[PDB]
Curated annotation (Swiss-Prot), chain A:
Sequence similarity: Belongs to the eukaryotic ribosomal protein eS6 family.
Disulfide bonds: none
Keywords per UniProt: Phosphoprotein, Ribonucleoprotein, Ribosomal protein
One BP annotation, GO: translation
Keyword Ribosomal protein part of the UniProt annotation: yes
Range of the intact protein held here: 1 to 177 of 236
PTM entry text: Phosphorylated.
Gene Ontology molecular function: any one: structural constituent of ribosome
Record flagged with keyword Ribosomal protein: yes
Domain of life: Eukaryota
GO cellular component: ribonucleoprotein complex; ribosome
Name of the protein this chain belongs to: Small ribosomal subunit protein eS6
Length: 177, 188, 260
RNA sequence: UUCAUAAUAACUUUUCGAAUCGCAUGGCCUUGUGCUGGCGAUGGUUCAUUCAAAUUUCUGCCCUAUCAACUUUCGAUGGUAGGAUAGUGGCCUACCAUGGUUUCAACGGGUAACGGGGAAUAAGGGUUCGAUUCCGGAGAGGGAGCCUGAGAAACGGCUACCA
RNA sequence: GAAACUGCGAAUGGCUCAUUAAAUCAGUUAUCGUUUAUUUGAUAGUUCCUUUACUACAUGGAUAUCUGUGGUAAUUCUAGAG
């Protein structure tokens, strides 16, 4: 089934389709938050290791963390919980949700890749996706720079330049606090 | 869901009032606190108009006051010995208002010792002159000395742990104690 | 109703706003403020209807927003502000000043009143209490809480707020033989002198009032507002001074004072 | 009035006591980013006031006795203490007392009954109507349960059963 | 100036008369028996705790929006990553 792999440090991710019945066999009976070695999931996944963080059932129902069940269940979700977003304040809703134990009923497995392996993936182990915007708060910018705080963090704010086609103009965030 | 409205009650005459205006939210009643002893665990409940209320189940220590010389001290509640409403709470050690409890009684003891120093149960010149000016007025009655020798004070709680969250009360003293000890001797 | 009510249908509006029963389904509900909505007067009613300076709601909104209205020395940019009895409405444009006093028919009449006296306001004392840390304070009918009042100022009394600093300037003590105004019931707008104040142990004080024309009536003490000493009112009384001429006398006034 | 308020002793899984925005950015010279400094906007504890909300006293309701006794073990009337309540209150619990209404019609039954301001009718007295332009109450298919808030037992908010 | 977070209203208004015969309601009282966003008027030095060593010229981390990967036949369904 579909596997959504995401490498955080490179900030990259990809989707992988697997049809073999035995590569996914190790994913069976493994709950969210566990670690599975990449040797048993693919001969091109040597050295890799996979944290399992969420997924989607064949019916589209995602799996909630901490359900410890290989089946679906109807739960009364509210604000703070995942698998649900409230429209009105305090709007509890009873919705179906897949359990946290991975079984054959899953359709997508969301997988963090934790340890860099031997054979590099195409654009995940190799490429890096830049962060779309930097820090905004003054001390946050200082920490991101290691700026020896009494150093006039005013100027060191990042500045993104965009060209309208005729005029090149700068846009930089306003510093809070 | 526990209502406290008067509609469900029969009329003064005795007629069975027909159902009308399904019960509201400004008529609600919540579960009893039925507090216990030990491992302080107070749960806030958001009541009408904010005004955080505090359920005080499992409460072990609280403030207690002495009326004669009028001094208050934090001290431990050690079990309940009598309840004027239901002895079932006494057997279950459920602590509500007006219940009668026992007190570790030490803080009162060395407060007395540093205040009068009469050595119950059996220095700087300023303190000596204070004691001399006192001139042994601490002629506090005999039964309180009796349970001071015993070590556990007899107190009646006055705060409402169900609402306030505190565990405050006052020691039995004077004819108060008298009355209740008779009742206790009735239990004995 | 579950909660507060925020709509005032036109027929349910007080008959002293005396709007047109047609040309509208609703009426301006006064927002919360210094006066009871049954007793108060919204600014939109005072401008659109009483003064006709505006024409409709948008015009009143534009008038209030640009800070030309000043209620008791403050701007009050909200459309339905409850400008109540004895409040002062200042318009720097046309440099005009109004004080809301009932005309004897019992209505919030347009009273054009001078700038010099417009600096201050009068108020009835509704409570005298002791707030925290032992500070005495006085609550007037506007809801103004004046701190540190004169020690012998009592309830039902009257006082003269300077309306600039908002402190105590002078006061008049409630007692017999004193010029007085009426602020409710059948005797709206009437002005007289207190002849007697029967105590009525247990509640609802009553006072007897005799006006200049030597007519006599009786009114509840909650309904009473001392306004000064006989012959020397502390404010500028409206035209007619609230004598309550009889309907036949009003007809005779129409017949006599008549020129076309 | 045990009221307002003040005071002492203590208590708190210690609430609040501005790390928030706009405009104008003046004055002092300690001539520096230095010292101060106006008009507002949002907040914020408490006490008032207002919009209110809950209860609450007296009196007033259509037909019917082919409805004369009704209510209490399961609260019926009262007492006390506690719990809950925002708060009084059998509102609920524990233990007691055996009480409360009734021929001045209680209780039960019926209402093709929402109550009222009012409408028709008109010598005077009245008879009938009032679902609906205003004020109240209740309801969102019938039932129960609840989060959020100051305010809902909300339903153009949710939970469950029944249809 | 979209979007989203925040704040506020969504409990007003509108409709219907099904239930309800001391029930609602009307007139008249009471709250010294209580909650009250808002509006309006006032309202606080002590947050130090042994003060002879602290950020007050400003303390911390998430988090939506967004960038990208999906799932379901579909619903104001949203899980993973930055
Ligand atoms: Mg309505
Ligand atoms: Mg007091
Ligand atoms: Mg009681
Ligand atoms: Mg009917
Ligand atoms: Mg009707
Ligand atoms: Mg009718
Ligand atoms: Mg009908
Ligand atoms: Mg209506
Ligand atoms: Mg409803
Ligand atoms: Mg229908
Ligand atoms: Mg709100
Ligand atoms: Mg409902
Ligand atoms: Mg609808
Ligand atoms: Mg609705
Ligand atoms: Mg909803
Ligand atoms: Mg009946």
């Amino acid at each position: 089934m579909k596997l959504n792999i995401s490498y955080p440090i490179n900030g990259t991710q990809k989707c992988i389709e697997i049809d073999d019945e035995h590569r996914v066999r190790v994913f069976y009976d493994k709950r969210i938050g566990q670690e599975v070695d990449g040797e048993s999931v693919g001969d091109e996944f040597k050295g890799y290791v996979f944290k399992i963080a969420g997924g989607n059932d064949k019916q589209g129902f995602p799996m909630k963390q901490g359900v410890l069940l290989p089946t679906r269940v109807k739960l009364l979700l509210a604000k703070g919980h995942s698998c649900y977003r409230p429209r009105r304040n305090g709007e509890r809703k009873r919705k179906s949700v897949r359990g946290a134990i991975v079984g054959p009923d899953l359709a997508v497995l969301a997988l963090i890749i934790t340890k860099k392996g031997e054979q590099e993936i195409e654009g995940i182990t190799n490429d890096t996706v830049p962060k779309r915007l930097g820090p905004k708060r003054a001390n946050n910018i200082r920490k991101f720079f290691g700026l020896t705080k009494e150093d006039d963090v005013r100027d060191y704010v990042i500045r993104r330049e965009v060209t309208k086609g005729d005029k090149s103009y700068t846009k930089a965030p306003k510093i809070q606090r | 869901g526990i209502s406290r409205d008067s509609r469900h009650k029969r009329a003064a005459t005795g007629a069975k009032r027909a159902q009308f205006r399904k019960k509201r939210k400004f008529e609600l009643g919540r579960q009893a606190a039925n507090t216990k002893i030990g491992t302080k665990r107070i749960h806030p409940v958001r009541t009408r108009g904010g005004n955080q209320k505090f359920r005080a189940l499992r409460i072990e220590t609280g403030n207690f006051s002495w009326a004669s010389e009028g001094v208050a001290r934090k001290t431990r509640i050690t079990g309940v010995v009598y309840h004027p409403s239901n002895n079932e709470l006494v057997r279950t050690n459920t602590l509500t208002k007006a219940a009668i409890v026992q007190i570790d009684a030490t803080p009162f003891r060395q407060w007395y010792e540093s205040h009068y120093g009469q050595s119950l149960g059996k220095t700087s010149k300023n303190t000596e002159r204070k004691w001399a000016a006192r001139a042994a007025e601490a002629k506090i009655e005999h039964a309180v000395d009796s349970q001071f020798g015993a070590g556990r004070l007899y107190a009646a709680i006055s705060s409402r742990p169900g609402q306030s969250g505190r565990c405050d009360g006052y020691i039995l003293e004077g004819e108060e104690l008298a009355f209740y000890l008779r009742r206790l001797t009735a239990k004995k | 109703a579950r909660g507060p009510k925020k709509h005032l249908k036109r027929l349910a509006a007080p008959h002293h706003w005396m709007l047109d029963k047609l040309s509208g389904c609703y009426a301006p509900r006064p927002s919360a403020g210094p006066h009871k909505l049954r007793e108060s007067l919204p600014l939109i009613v005072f401008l659109r209807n009483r003064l006709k300076y505006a024409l409709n709601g948008r015009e009143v909104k534009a008038i209030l927003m640009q800070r030309h209205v000043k209620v008791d020395g403050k701007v009050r940019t909200d459309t339905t502000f409850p400008a109540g009895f004895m409040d002062v409405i200042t318009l720097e444009a046309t440099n005009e000043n109004f004080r809301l006093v009932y005309d004897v028919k019992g209505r919030f009449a347009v009273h054009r009143i001078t700038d010099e006296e417009a600096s201050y306001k009068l108020a009835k004392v509704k409570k005298v209490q002791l707030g925290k840390k032992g500070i005495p304070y006085v609550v007037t009918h506007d809801g103004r809480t004046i701190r540190y009042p004169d020690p012998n100022i009592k309830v039902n009394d009257t006082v003269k707020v300077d309306l600039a600093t908002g402190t105590i300037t002078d006061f008049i003590k409630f007692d017999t033989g004193k010029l007085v105004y009426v602020t409710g019931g059948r005797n709206l707008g009437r002005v007289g002198t207190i002849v007697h104040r029967e105590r009525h142990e247990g509640g609802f004080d009553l006072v007897h009032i005799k006006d200049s024309l030597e007519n006599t009536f009786v009114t509840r003490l909650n309904n009473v507002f001392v306004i000064g000493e006989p012959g020397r009112p502390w404010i500028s009384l409206p035209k007619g001074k609230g004598i309550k001429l009889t309907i036949s006398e009003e007809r005779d006034r129409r017949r006599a004072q008549h020129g076309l």
